[PDB]
């Protein structure tokens, strides 16, 4: 398994290799990769949720965001 946490089970949530907030794998085109920690985040799982993917070069997740 590429991921030791969920063993690549598609029917299992995994906050390590899929959305770090909800554990879901759907919509990878809508999953933002943090430029610091490299975790994935659905745009619609963020608080606040984004209606689209940001055009900006770099993006930092809520855990890494420098307030």
């Amino acid at each position: 398994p590429s991921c030791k946490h969920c063993k690549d089970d598609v029917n299992r949530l995994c906050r390590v290799c899929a959305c770090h907030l909800c554990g879901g794998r759907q919509d990878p085109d809508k999953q933002l990769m943090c430029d610091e920690c490299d975790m994935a985040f659905h745009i619609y799982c963020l608080d606040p949720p984004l209606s689209s993917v940001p055009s900006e070069d770099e993006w930092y997740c809520p855990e890494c965001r420098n307030d």
């Binding site: 990878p28 085109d29 990769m33 430029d35 993006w59």
Partner: peptide, 6 residues
């Protein structure tokens, strides 16, 4: 920004 798909 970079997505999972990329």
């Amino acid at each position: 920004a970079r997505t999972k798909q990329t």
